[PDB]
Structure formats: C-alpha cells, structure tokens
Amino acid sequence: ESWAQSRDEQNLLQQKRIWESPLLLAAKDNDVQALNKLLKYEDCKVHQRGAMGETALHIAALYDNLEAAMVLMEAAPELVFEPMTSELYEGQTALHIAVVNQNMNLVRALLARRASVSARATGTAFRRSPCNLIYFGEHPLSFAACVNSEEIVRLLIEHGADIRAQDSLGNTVLHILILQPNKTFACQMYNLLLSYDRHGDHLQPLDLVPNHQGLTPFKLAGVEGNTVMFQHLMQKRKHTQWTYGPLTSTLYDLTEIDSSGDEQSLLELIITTKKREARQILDQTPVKELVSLKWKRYGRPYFCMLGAIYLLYIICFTMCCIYRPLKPRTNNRTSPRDNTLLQQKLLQEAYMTPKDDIRLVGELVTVIGAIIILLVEVPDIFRMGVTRFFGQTILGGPFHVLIITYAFMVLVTMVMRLISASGEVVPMSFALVLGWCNVMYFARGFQMLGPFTIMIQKMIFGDLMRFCWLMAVVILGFASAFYIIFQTEDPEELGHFYDYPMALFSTFELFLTIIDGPANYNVDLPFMYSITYAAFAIIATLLMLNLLIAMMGDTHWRVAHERDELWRAQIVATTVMLERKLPRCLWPRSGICGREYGLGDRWFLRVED
Amino acid sequence: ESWAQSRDEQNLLQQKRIWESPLLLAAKDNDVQALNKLLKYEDCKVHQRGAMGETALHIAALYDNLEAAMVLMEAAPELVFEPMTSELYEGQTALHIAVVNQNMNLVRALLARRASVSARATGTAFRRSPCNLIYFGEHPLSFAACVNSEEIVRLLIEHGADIRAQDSLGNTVLHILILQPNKTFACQMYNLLLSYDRHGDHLQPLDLVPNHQGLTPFKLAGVEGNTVMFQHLMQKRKHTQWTYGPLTSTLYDLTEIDSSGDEQSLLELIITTKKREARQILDQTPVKELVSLKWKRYGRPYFCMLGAIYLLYIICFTMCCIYRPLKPRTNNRTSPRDNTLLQQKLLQEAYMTPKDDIRLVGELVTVIGAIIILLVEVPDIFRMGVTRFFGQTILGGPFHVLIITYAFMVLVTMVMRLISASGEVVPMSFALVLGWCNVMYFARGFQMLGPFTIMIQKMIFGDLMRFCWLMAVVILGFASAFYIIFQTEDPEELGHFYDYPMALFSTFELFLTIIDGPANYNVDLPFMYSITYAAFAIIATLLMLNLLIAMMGDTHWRVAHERDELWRAQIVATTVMLERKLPRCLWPRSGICGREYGLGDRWFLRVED
Ligand SMILES: CCCCCCCC/C=C/CCCCCCCC(=O)O[C@@H](COC(=O)CCCCCCCCCCCCCCC)COP(=O)([O-])OCC[N+](C)(C)C
Ligand SMILES: CCCCCCCC/C=C/CCCCCCCC(=O)O[C@@H](COC(=O)CCCCCCCCCCCCCCC)COP(=O)([O-])OCC[N+](C)(C)C
Ligand SMILES: CCCCCCCC/C=C/CCCCCCCC(=O)O[C@@H](COC(=O)CCCCCCCCCCCCCCC)COP(=O)([O-])OCC[N+](C)(C)C
Ligand SMILES: CCCCCCCC/C=C/CCCCCCCC(=O)O[C@@H](COC(=O)CCCCCCCCCCCCCCC)COP(=O)([O-])OCC[N+](C)(C)C
Ligand SMILES: CCCCCCCC/C=C\CCCCCCCC(=O)O[C@@H](COC(=O)CCCCCCCCCCCCCCC)COP(=O)([O-])OCC[N+](C)(C)C
Ligand SMILES: CCCCCCCC/C=C\CCCCCCCC(=O)O[C@@H](COC(=O)CCCCCCCCCCCCCCC)COP(=O)([O-])OCC[N+](C)(C)C
Ligand SMILES: CC(C)CCC[C@@H](C)[C@H]1CC[C@H]2[C@@H]3CC=C4C[C@@H](OC(=O)CCC(=O)O)CC[C@]4(C)[C@H]3CC[C@]12C
Ligand SMILES: CC(C)CCC[C@@H](C)[C@H]1CC[C@H]2[C@@H]3CC=C4C[C@@H](OC(=O)CCC(=O)O)CC[C@]4(C)[C@H]3CC[C@]12C
Ligand SMILES: CC(C)CCC[C@@H](C)[C@H]1CC[C@H]2[C@@H]3CC=C4C[C@@H](OC(=O)CCC(=O)O)CC[C@]4(C)[C@H]3CC[C@]12C
Ligand SMILES: CC(C)CCC[C@@H](C)[C@H]1CC[C@H]2[C@@H]3CC=C4C[C@@H](OC(=O)CCC(=O)O)CC[C@]4(C)[C@H]3CC[C@]12C
Ligand SMILES: CC(C)CCC[C@@H](C)[C@H]1CC[C@H]2[C@@H]3CC=C4C[C@@H](OC(=O)CCC(=O)O)CC[C@]4(C)[C@H]3CC[C@]12C
Ligand SMILES: CC(C)CCC[C@@H](C)[C@H]1CC[C@H]2[C@@H]3CC=C4C[C@@H](OC(=O)CCC(=O)O)CC[C@]4(C)[C@H]3CC[C@]12C
Ligand SMILES: [Ca+2]
C-alpha cells in the first residue's frame, strides 16, 4: 500500500517542484518573453532538475510546448540527450513523451540537432505489472506502435531505429502489440512493423523471435486469449490446396500448435496458463480440429482402457477390505456401551489358510498399484513445481490430490498390517471413499457425464463451502443449546445430546433432516426444547432452501453456458496429459508429415470446409 | 383522506364560484366588450374574490388572458399586487401562474406598472410532500427554473430578483433543481443560475449555501440519488494533473465526500437515508475508489480482528454453559413422566473447587463482554433516536438487535446466578443461539460470504414470513383435527397428539416432514386419521414446494442482480460505523492532505485511469 502511497505522493510532489522557480516556469507555459530575460541578465545555469530529476524540456513535452525550448537550444544545445535520472520513470527521455502524446514537429527539431532514438525507459511505471495501467515497452518505436501512430513509426526507421530491439522481458515490438487492449489497431501495426525485415544476412524473422519465456508472438497470442491476433497470425500458417465451388481444402502448418518434444506447445500452454480468455482459442480452426482428432482416435480409447483398469483395481482393493482378517475378541467387554465383537488378527495369524493367499494376491496388487500411482505423480513435482506449480494445477484437478491421498492411505494400511498396528479401518475407510470417488475422474471421457461432473466441483468449492460456514455457525449455536437443555435429563429416554460431541453430530444430522430427531411422548421434555427445535427447524429449512437457490444461480447463470467449453477444455487437458505420460510408439503424431510431399519436415493438418 | 377530499372539493367549488358573476366572467374568456359595459354604467367595485380569495386576474393567468385585464388596469391600476388570501395556494400571485404557464407579454405590462417579483407562495400545494405532484419552491425565480424557462430567468434578474433566496425549508433555487424529475434540463438551469454570483463583498458561494438539514446542493444530489447532477457537480471538485497519452491523473477534492468531524458526510448520508437510488452514487468515480481504499487498508483488517475476538468470546461463553454447575436432584420424581436427573447448584455450592474458578474467569469475561456490548450500543440511542432513528436502522441491521438481545440474556443469567433463581437454561439457550448466529454478521467482511448472507435476511423478512402465516393456518386446522381424532384413543400406543400443545408441535414437525409421524401397525388407527393425514401431506408438500418457488423469484429476479451492490453498500455501512466507533490515532484519514503541496488544508484522492 505504501508504494502506491509513495507513487501518489510523487505525482503531487512533482506539481509543487514547478512553482518555486522561473526557469522551469517559462518552459511549462507559452511565456517565451520572460525566458529571454531569464538568460541574458544574470547568466544562470539551466540544468535545474525537477522531482523526477528531469529538465524543463520533459514538462514541455508533457504539455505540448515547442516555442520557448528553441531558445533553450540556441543557448544550451546539449539539452536533448539528458534522460530522467529518477527511479519511477527511469531513462525516459523527451522523445518518449512526445511520442505517446503524438507530437510530430518536435522530432524535426531534435533530430536536426542529432537526437537519440535508442533510449530505454526501464522505469517501473512502464513495466508489465497490474499497478501500471499501460504496458508499452521500453523503446520509442514501442510507444508509437501502441498509441497507434503510423507516422512516428516511419519517422524513426528513417532516423536509425531498430525493430528487433527487446525489453528487459525480451518482448520485441511485435510481442507488445499482442498485449494491447485495443485489438484491431494492433493488427494494422503488426502488418506495418513486420514489413521492415529486408535483410538476408540476418537469419531470424521478426515474428519468430522469442521473449524470455520462449514464446513467439503467435504463441503469445495463444496464452493471452487474443483471438483476433490469433486468426490473423494463422494466415501465415495456412495453405489453400484447391477450391471446388463451395468447397476448399486448407492445409494448416500445425508446427507451433502441436507438441515437438521438450519445447512447450500451444495446447499445453492454454491449459497450464492462469488466464481464462485463452480457452476461446481452443475452438479455433486449426485447434478445434486437432483436439477432436487426437481425442476421437487416441485419447478416448486410451482413457477408457485406463478407466477399465482403474475400475478393476478398485474392485480388487474393495474385496481385500471386505475380507480383511478378523477374529473374535480376546478380552471381555468393559462396559454395556462396548459394542465390539471382533478384532483384527496379527500378522502371524492373518496368513494361515488358502483363503488368505487369494487375499494376499489382491493385497499385493493393491500395494503395487499404489506405488505405481506414487511413481508417476510424485516424481513429477521435483523437476516441476514442488508445491507451487503443482499447487496451481489443483484448481484444474483435485483428482491429482485424491489419487495420491488414496495411494498414501493404501501404504499406511500396508505399514499397519506389517507392524500389527490397531486401527486399520481408519486408513482403509479413507481409501475406500477416495478410491471409489476417483472413478468420477473418468466421467470426463463421456459425452453424458463430462459436463455434469464439472458442475460438482464448482459447487463444492463455491456454494457448498459457502453454505458450510453459515451451517457450522447455526449448528454450533443450536447444538450448545440442545446440549444444555437436555443436560439435566435422563439420556436413557432421549440420548441425542448425551455428551457434547454427540450433540454436535446430532444437530448436524437434524440440520440436514437425515435423522428424525428427539421425541419420546411417554415423558415430559423440557419446554425450551420445543421452542429451540421449532426455531432450529425453521432456520434449517430456510437455509437448506437457500442453498438450493445459490446452486441455481451458480449453474444456469455462470456454468451452464460454458458446459461444453469447460468440458472440451477437460478433453484437451486430458489429451495433453495422456500423451506426455505415455510412450512414443503407442502415440502416432497428429497430422500428416511432409518429406513425401515436398512440404518439409513439418506435420500438416488438412481441413476441408 | 378528508384533506384530499377537502382538496377535491375546493377545485370543484372553484369552478362554481366563477359562474354567478359577470365581473369575473369577462376576465375568464376573451369577452372584452361586456366588461366595458360592466364598468361605466353602474360603477361597481372590482375587488370581488373567488374561492381561493383571488381576484379575476389569477383566472386570466391560469387560462392565458391578456386583453380584458388592460382595461382592469386603466380603471383599477392597483390590481397587480394582491395575492391569494386562501390557505391551499397561499401567497401565490398572478406572476407565479404566468411563469409556470410561461407567459411572457404579461411580465412587460405588469412590471411597467411596478409589479412584484419577491413574492412567496407558502401555500400547502407548493410544499415538499407526496400529496403534491410538483415541488417548485416559493419564489417566481424558482418556478421558472423548474419549468425550464431561460427567458423568464433573465427577465427577473433585470427586474430586481434574488438568486440567494430560500424556501421555508431553506432550499435555494440550486437545491430545487436537484429535486426535479427532469434531470438533464436541471443541469442547464444549474449552469445558467450559478453564473450570476458577481459579488465579492458577500462571502458565500451559491453552491455552498446549505438548506436547513445542513446539506449543500452537492450533498443533496447524493442523498436523492440524482446521479447525473452528481457527476456534473464533480467537475468543480476535480483537477487534472497530467495527461500521458491514454492515461490521465485526476485529483479529487474529497472534502464534502469524506468525513470531517461532527459534520455529517456523503458516505454516511447515503447509508442512513431512506432512499434507495442513492446507492448508485456509491459506485461513482470519487466514491467507489474512496470506499475500496479504506476497506482494503483499514476496514477489512479491523473487521477481521473484531470477528476473531468475537469468536473467541463466544467460544469462551459456550464453555461456561457446557460446564454450568449441576448436581443430582434432591427430591424424588413426582411421576413416571418426570425425566429430570439433575438440578443446578446454589451460589454457595457452585464455587468450591479449582475447576469452578477456571469457569469463574470465563463467566466474568462473558459478563464483562456483555456490559461493553451494552456500553457501545445503548448510549448511542439517547443522543440518537431513542426507538425511532435507531428503529429505522433495523432494516439495515438486525445484528444491532441480536447483539443487544445476546447481552441482555447474558446479564439475566448473571442475575439468576446471583440470586439462585431456577431456570438458567432459559436465558442461556437464547444466548447460545443469539451469540453464535451473530457470527454471521462477520460474513460481510468476505468476498464469498457477503452476498450470500444478505439473501438470508431478505427471505426471512419476505418469503419465509410470508410462508409462515399460511403455514400457521394449515398447522392450526390439522393439529386440531389430529387432536380430536386421537382424543378417544390410547396415547401409549400413539402419543403424537396426546394433548393440544403437543398436537400443535407434532403437526408443525409433520408439516416440515422432520418427524416420521404416526404409525403403529399393531393397532387400528381411526379411519379419519388416514384421510386427514393424506390430505395434510399433499397440502404440506404443495406448500413446501411453493416456498421453494417464491425464494427463486425473490433472488434471481429481485436480489441476484444486486448482490454486489447490496454487499458493497454493506462494506460502506460497516466502514463508516467502524470509524465512528474507533479512535482517531488508529485510523489514518483517507486521501493525501495538502499544505505540503500548495493545495490547502484539504485531503485529496488521486485516480489514474
Ligand atoms: C468449513 C467447515 C466449518 C467447520 C467449523 C468448525 C466447527 C467444528 C468444531 C468442532 C469442535 C469439537 C470439539 C468439542 C468437543 C471435544 C470433546 C470434549 O471432551 O469436550 C468436552 C467439553 O469441551 C468443550 O466444551 C468444547 C466446546 C466449546 C465450544 C466449541 C467451539 C470451538 C470450535 C471452533 C469452531 C469455530 C468455527 C466457527 C466458524 C465461523 C465435552 O464435555 P463432556 O466430556 O461431554 O462432559 C463434561 C462433564 N461435566 C461438565 C459434567 C463435568
Ligand atoms: C425463525 C423464528 C424464530 C422464533 C423465535 C421463538 C420465540 C421464543 C420466545 C419464547 C418466549 C417464552 C417464554 C419462556 C419463559 C418461560 C418461563 C416460565 O415460567 O414458564 C413456565 C410455564 O411454561 C409455559 O407453559 C409457557 C410456555 C412458553 C410461552 C409460549 C412460548 C411459545 C411461543 C409462541 C409464539 C411463537 C412466535 C414465533 C414466530 C415465528 C415454565 O416454568 P415451570 O413449569 O415451573 O418449569 C418446571 C418444569 N421443569 C422442571 C420440567 C423444567
Ligand atoms: C408469524 C407466525 C404465525 C403465528 C400464528 C400463531 C399460532 C400459535 C398459537 C399458539 C396457541 C397455544 C396455546 C394453546 C394451548 C394452551 C395450553 C392449554 O392448556 O390449552 C388447553 C385447551 O386450550 C385450548 O383449547 C386453546 C386452543 C384453542 C384454539 C387456538 C387458536 C388461538 C391461537 C391464535 C392463533 C391465530 C393466528 C392465525 C394466523 C392467521 C389444552 O387442553 P388440555 O389441557 O390438553 O386437555 C383438557 C382436558 N379435557 C378437555 C379432557 C377436559
Ligand atoms: C389435497 C386433496 C384433498 C383430498 C380430500 C380428501 C377427501 C375426504 C372425503 C372422505 C369421504 C369418506 C367418507 C367418510 C365417512 C365414513 C362413515 C362410515 O360409516 O364409514 C365406516 C366404514 O369406513 C370405511 O371403510 C370407508 C372409508 C372411507 C371411504 C373412502 C375414503 C377414501 C377417499 C378415496 C378417494 C380420494 C380422493 C381424493 C383426491 C385427491 C366407518 O364406520 P365404523 O366402522 O362403524 O367406525 C367404528 C370404528 N372405530 C370405533 C374405530 C371408530
Ligand atoms: C467389472 C465388474 C465385473 C468384474 C468381475 C469381478 C467382480 C465380482 C467378482 C467376484 C465377487 C463375488 C464373488 C464372492 C467372492 C468369493 C471369493 C472366494 O473364493 O473367497 C475365498 C477368499 O476370498 C478372497 O481371498 C478374495 C479377497 C480379495 C482377492 C481379490 C482377487 C485376487 C485374485 C487375482 C485378481 C487380480 C486383480 C486384477 C488387477 C488389475 C474363500 O473364502 P470363503 O470362506 O470360502 O468364502 C465363501 C463362503 N462365504 C461367503 C459363505 C463365507
Ligand atoms: C478459535 C478456535 C481455537 C481456540 C482455542 C480454545 C477452543 C478449544 C479449547 C479447549 C476445549 C477442549 C478442552 C476441554 C476443556 C477442559 C478444561 C478444564 O480443565 O476443565 C476444568 C474446568 O473447566 C472449566 O472451568 C472451563 C469452563 C469455561 C472457562 C473458559 C476459559 C477461561 C480461561 C481464560 C480464557 C479467557 C478467554 C479470552 C477472552 C477473549 C477441570 O474440570 P474437569 O473435571 O477436570 O474436566 C475434565 C474431566 N472430564 C471431561 C473427563 C470430566
Ligand atoms: C497390479 C497393477 C495392474 C495395478 C493397477 C495399477 C493401475 C490401476 C494404476 C497404476 C498407476 C495409475 C495411474 C497413476 C496416475 C494417474 C494420473 C491421474 O491424473 C489425475 O488424477 C488428473 C487430475 C485432474 O486433472 O483432475 C489419472 C489416472 C492415472 C493415469 C492413474 C490411473 C491408474 C493407474 C494406471
Ligand atoms: C472416510 C470419509 C470421512 C471420507 C471423507 C473424505 C473427504 C475429504 C472426501 C470424500 C469424497 C471426496 C470428494 C470426491 C470427489 C471429488 C472430485 C472433485 O469433484 C468434481 O466435481 C470433480 C472435478 C471436475 O469434474 O473437474 C473435487 C473433489 C471431490 C469433491 C472430493 C473432495 C474430498 C472428499 C469430499
Ligand atoms: C458444518 C459442516 C462443514 C460439517 C461439520 C459438522 C460437524 C458438527 C461434524 C463434522 C465431524 C463430526 C465429528 C466426527 C466424529 C465424531 C466422533 C463420534 O464418536 C466419538 O467421539 C467416539 C465414540 C463415543 O464414545 O461416542 C462423536 C461425534 C464426532 C465428534 C463428530 C461430531 C460432529 C462433527 C464435528
Ligand atoms: C473481556 C473482554 C475481552 C470481552 C470481549 C468483548 C468483545 C468480544 C465485545 C465487547 C463489545 C463488543 C462490540 C459491541 C457492539 C458492536 C456493534 C456491532 O454492530 C452491529 O451489530 C451492526 C448491526 C448491523 O448493521 O447489522 C458490531 C460488533 C460490535 C463492535 C461488538 C464486537 C464485540 C465486542 C468488541
Ligand atoms: C432459542 C430460540 C427460540 C431463539 C429464537 C430465535 C433465534 C433462533 C434467533 C437467534 C439467531 C437469530 C438470527 C441470526 C441472524 C440473523 C440476521 C439477519 O439475517 C441475515 O441474513 C443478516 C442480515 C444481512 O446479512 O444484512 C436477520 C435476523 C437473523 C436471521 C436472526 C433472527 C433471530 C434468530 C433466528
Ligand atoms: C408457524 C411458524 C411461524 C412457527 C410456529 C409453530 C407453532 C405451532 C409452535 C411455535 C412454538 C411452539 C411451542 C413451543 C413450546 C412448547 C412447550 C412444549 O412443552 C411444554 O409445554 C411443557 C412440557 C410438557 O408438559 O409436555 C409443548 C409444545 C409447545 C407448546 C410448542 C407448541 C408448538 C408451537 C406453538
Ligand atoms: Ca424416521
């Protein structure tokens, strides 16, 4: 907060550092006559700095003043070069300011006195960060491209500029147009600026030059959701084979869209980026067909063979828990509240029959399966993000967490079976619930179950969790009242609130109306019970019918319009994942390779519409 | 009703008092020739009054008649001055009527005979009240401004008018334009009328002059929801620091918008006014940023430290009720329906162990907390509205009532503990429910829980209370039938309706289907039970599914479009409250103060867009 407070103070401190001098006053407004009196009488020094360490020329450019600064140059011609020596607008010179305010006559007077066009505004007000409402780059070519000024673009190339110049982020000027809020004007700048390569000794095209994330402008249009620069960039990568009346056969280049090894690709970048406007690109004319190609041919068959193996694995795990080793209890019961008949066997006792060795096969299969789950999910964070970049992906998939939590609870049950620890029902019951509810992951490989299963996630991490805080508040208040109302009664005749953890659990069940809840009719209940439970029942059904509301504004007004789009993005995230963690010989590469067609070492996709 | 009946009779009695005289007849229509016969033959008196005590001239102005009234002035020149001597349009003269009907030639003939322009229509038809469909003021400048007549505005300033003149409410003419139903025409009158200050010896600007509620025109635009006069008035309070291409840095005056001590402010006026169109102003360009400033920096941290203290306080209170002093009962049970095992200890017995003194700390903390709740909420009605202005604020907050009802029930439990009164479970159970459901107040300081918690209030004081009247009717009829059906049976085999208060409570539970309800299958139930309960079950599920309807027209068609707006208004109401009841040294004032920037003793807000 203090940096935005410091930035708010520097703009006000700038407006005060003008008013206490005449030499910086005649170069703010159009008062040229006093400035001729300021120079010849006392012969004062003219390099007086303002708040940002700048000369009076930067105030002239920021308010469009040309006339007094001529006498500044007939007397002190060296004024052109000196940039801002500040720390917020650092390295910004007078040329940058006249570019974004689009002054043209100042360029003809500066450059006649050998001005500078390769200056780099590296200050913090020009960087790519959400505090700054503009991002233009660092160079004066970059600024004129972004305020949509064709004249200043050609006026710099005449004066020794450079279009292959980059930011500290590595963005060239072609990258920066893709980042602009005004999309259609960026398309015209892109065609204007790309048309100045004109050098064969240099090998790199300007639209192939990557920034420091290794992204081209084409891939930067994909990551940012710039769909009209995506379609515009796609004509460099089309080829029209033939036109047959209403038909045409278009061949798509597919080189930077599909994966080519260790280099990151457009399909994987759209999924693994934090931006949501990138998912509109997943419906475009080389990409929508590419995704439907590899899902219908290789993705969906493998995802169904993976879900048929997983289903048999959990059915095998379920039988090992149903047949877990149990024996009659040894000590006698300690109290009439003791319900236990059976306890689990020791390791020396639990494998002593042919019926046990059928279970040992399934137990070893279960253990082997949990290790293979931890060998393909846990080694993919130590080269990846340890808890950060894996932690970002959790909103895309909770089933990563669920299948590791399953495999954790299997191996805890293994350890407790090895050391004869008591309480194997605790890790098993988590594992039965975790392992079976992971079958819902494979719902995304079906037309019927895919868009319904996404609705489940967005209501548990939205409106269900939202309801649970308000539910916990009501439960805690009424369970405490129900506890102290029945605290003086006999629990043998009404035991719902006999101690305080049972009173919490009973009130929870009463909230959901899943237990019938306290009545005897042979005995006098306290009168406060009938008052409190009537009030509880009105509030609980009010709240329950309110959760039913919020789940209907959640779906039909937020996530029913995007059922297919969120589900098609799940097919892409699955198909990308199911190719990276699968061998090369099982997965043919998508598209048709050249070198048998005179097309190169490229893989091409044909679309006939 | 009788005053609107009296007002309806006076307009009809006015239409009859014309027809019985010739001297008031020739001055209604264009019959000038008979009027020259009415004057010279019998030489009659001309000051004959109508129904509102008015002369015949007011009938001429009300129907645009100029020609006969000239001979009225060549014979009786003193006719100009005499106002209405009525009590509904009191003090209205002929100049007011010709202004609102926009006659111009009558002004040139009256004022040539020294007419009056400082007349005050103080009658009841011109006051600000919902019976009157216009509110124009009292002065003839005020009327011409409101019917949008620029010519008559300049025609009065030439004739000795006064723009600094006020109503009996204290509204100047600039106040009255803000109150008009035609917003855009009021903006042009505002620029026309403000441009006539032109006096340096007088100190007060016309747009700074307050009415009797101490409100400027700027604050009157805030209170009334006049958003286009709010934005128009805001340009007097902006200052553009610089423009950098697409960027500009605007500095907002923020003096009459933020609080300056005991004088009432714009943020607190929007919240504490009864009007709902004022909440649109809470989204405007100096106000939306000011609110998000002090909530994100000071409001939200303090509201979370206040909710973390309150949560620990209620957890401490909950433990004191769970560990309340109880002993085995002394007398024997009086009947087999007596379920009580325990009774509470006396004061001499309830503090006799180290386990009691841990509870005495928590009980004293609970008591001290309830006094501090009553010291910051109850002394704020005796200088405020005792039950009226506090009573108006209840629709904004029920948690005022809930936290005082909590603190009332704590101290009743204190008194009953001090005097060994029996029945402490009655004030405690209210206090556990009231104290825990007050945690839902702190839901408004979160993005997730804020708009959901407002939905709860608007359905309990709307559709739930609406359903409860219809529910009580059905419950009362069927409980009485269920009572008399089972009135001849043995309640040992079916006890749901054994007496009439249990029959009411059972039918309530049966309505909500939260108890399973009567079946035995070993015994013959009355045949009327199966008829009545089938009819009850159809009606109860019909009604329950109808409550589910009404809660979906309530939200998605009334209060889902305004979830963020009702929740942002709750942030303003919380931030205003949490600054007034909090010290000065903990709360830095919002904005940047001048006097180190040449800007005055004002606090300014900078907005860069
Ligand atoms: C996203 C989902 C939301 C989850 C919310 C979390 C809710 C879940 C919380 C669960 C807490 C469960 C533990 C309580 C019981 C422990 C067992 C025990 O022995 O206690 C004992 C008493 O102990 C107490 O009195 C503790 C209760 C005090 C108030 C609890 C509030 C704190 C929870 C923080 C929640 C704040 C969150 C509010 C949210 C805004 C029981 O007594 P006894 O042994 O039976 O008899 C004593 C005998 N004698 C008295 C006759 C001598
Ligand atoms: C979401 C909506 C929330 C609603 C909030 C709920 C409102 C809550 C307000 C409750 C106020 C009730 C006062 C309680 C104080 C009783 C003290 C007393 O002396 O009583 C005595 C008689 O008891 C009776 O016979 C009277 C029963 C209570 C009165 C009617 C309450 C029903 C509310 C109807 C209107 C409903 C309107 C609601 C509209 C919706 C009991 O004393 P005792 O016999 O000596 O005890 C010994 C027996 N023992 C040993 C077994 C212990
Ligand atoms: C916003 C929320 C809505 C709230 C609505 C309020 C509803 C809540 C109302 C609650 C009233 C509760 C009190 C009744 C029972 C008292 C106990 C008692 O002793 O009574 C006794 C009889 O007494 C009666 O018969 C009274 C019943 C007559 C009709 C009740 C309607 C009046 C309620 C006004 C409602 C109109 C509102 C309608 C709305 C349009 C019980 O008899 P017994 O002792 O068991 O046995 C006698 C023995 N013997 C016969 C064999 C000899
Ligand atoms: C929201 C919708 C609301 C619906 C309104 C509900 C309609 C209400 C209309 C009800 C009309 C019923 C007539 C009641 C009079 C009976 C008198 C008699 O003599 O019967 C005798 C035989 O009893 C029987 O065996 C016949 C049972 C009733 C007939 C069929 C009723 C079911 C309705 C089907 C159609 C449903 C259509 C509904 C469509 C929806 C009983 O006399 P007893 O044996 O001598 O008694 C001694 C036993 N005791 C000592 C134990 C006491
Ligand atoms: C997709 C849906 C269809 C799929 C088809 C399968 C689903 C449904 C199939 C069968 C279910 C119905 C048959 C009941 C089971 C009885 C088996 C038995 O003989 O019990 C024996 C022990 O039992 C065990 O030891 C098995 C425990 C787990 C082993 C898991 C299989 C391992 C084999 C390798 C597989 C590798 C896994 C592959 C890895 C990827 C003997 O005990 P008993 O005392 O004689 O008990 C019978 C008497 N009683 C009941 C009266 C007490
Ligand atoms: C936010 C969520 C986390 C917060 C953490 C806290 C939440 C959870 C924390 C603890 C809950 C779980 C522990 C159980 C409680 C046992 C304590 C005990 O020793 O009992 C004793 C008496 O007990 C009392 O006297 C306490 C009664 C209320 C005192 C309130 C605290 C005052 C201390 C100052 C605080 C100032 C408050 C601050 C003001 C703003 C001994 O009785 P006993 O007979 O030996 O009982 C045990 C045997 N039995 C059960 C088998 C019968
Ligand atoms: C003795 C043998 C035959 C045991 C059988 C083992 C298989 C049933 C297990 C072993 C490893 C498992 C895989 C390990 C990890 C994953 C990643 C997992 O990814 C997610 O959960 C994605 C998260 C999301 O996006 O929601 C999908 C299932 C899969 C392929 C698992 C499918 C089931 C496998 C093949
Ligand atoms: C032994 C008992 C107490 C188990 C309790 C453990 C819970 C923490 C588990 C049980 C089932 C789990 C759920 C089962 C299924 C899913 C998958 C997923 O839900 C979806 O809708 C899938 C996401 C998608 O479709 O993209 C998000 C997590 C969730 C709700 C799980 C969250 C964790 C849960 C609630
Ligand atoms: C509000 C939403 C988000 C769900 C939270 C509801 C809570 C009130 C639930 C969640 C877990 C429940 C607990 C889960 C396990 C148990 C153990 C259970 O049995 C025992 O403690 C041991 C057996 C005995 O001696 O009775 C008693 C209830 C209790 C504390 C439950 C009390 C009610 C709890 C706290
Ligand atoms: C021994 C000590 C530490 C006991 C602890 C005392 C606090 C937990 C209490 C004492 C006074 C209470 C305050 C008294 C009154 C109010 C006003 C209250 O305002 C409303 O209820 C607004 C109503 C609405 O608009 O809905 C908000 C909570 C607050 C600050 C209370 C918060 C909790 C406080 C600080
Ligand atoms: C022992 C029993 C019989 C007590 C009788 C009634 C109680 C259950 C009290 C304590 C909790 C109270 C509720 C707690 C929260 C609120 C605040 C408010 O609800 C909201 O949605 C908050 C307002 C907002 O968000 O602006 C309206 C009153 C209400 C429902 C209260 C109404 C009265 C209640 C139900
Ligand atoms: C219609 C909506 C708005 C709620 C109102 C429903 C009523 C039918 C409820 C509200 C309060 C209830 C009462 C709350 C307290 C009691 C005390 C309860 O126990 C006793 O009277 C003492 C013990 C005994 O001797 O049985 C019997 C039911 C009764 C009258 C309840 C009967 C049903 C009532 C009137
Ligand atoms: Ca039941």
Numbering used by the authors:
A (entry chain D), B (entry chain C): 27 to 635
What does the paper say about this structure?
TRPV6 is a calcium-selective ion channel implicated in epithelial Ca2+ uptake. TRPV6 is a representative of the vanilloid subfamily of transient receptor potential (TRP) channels that is considered the principal epithelial calcium channel for Ca2+ absorption in intestines and many other organs. The channel is assembled of four subunits and contains two main components: a TMD with a central ion channel pore and an intracellular skirt that is mostly built of ankyrin repeat domains connected to each other by three-stranded β-sheets, N-terminal helices, and C-terminal hooks. The TMD is composed of six transmembrane helices S1–S6 and a re-entrant pore loop (P-loop) between S5 and S6.
In contrast, RR inhibits TRPV6 by binding in the middle of the ion channel’s selectivity filter and plugging its pore like a bottle cork. Compared with the open-state structure, the structure solved in the presence of RR showed a distinct non-protein density in the middle of the ion channel pore that perfectly matched the shape of RR. High-resolution reconstruction of TRPV6RR allows precise placement of the inhibitor inside the ion channel pore. On the extracellular side, the RR-binding site is flanked by aspartates D542 with a spherical density on the top that might represent a calcium ion typically bound at D542 in the absence of RR. The inhibitor occupies the entire selectivity filter of TRPV6, which is lined by carboxyl groups of D542, backbone carbonyl oxygens of I541, I540, and T539 as well as the hydroxyl group of T539, and spans the upper half of the pore’s central cavity. The surface of the selectivity filter is highly electronegative, creating a favorable environment for the positively charged RR that carries a 6+ total charge. In contrast, the pores in TRPV6RR and TRPV6Eco were apparently closed due to a hydrophobic seal imposed by the gate residues L574 and M578. Correspondingly, S6 in TRPV6RR and TRPV6Eco was entirely α-helical, typical for the closed conformation of TRPV6. We hypothesize that the positive charge of RR creates an electric field inside the pore’s central cavity that interacts with the electric dipole of the S6 helix. This interaction causes repulsion of the lower portion of S6 away from RR, which results in partial S6 rotation and helps S6 to become completely α-helical, with side chains of L574 and M578 sealing the pore.
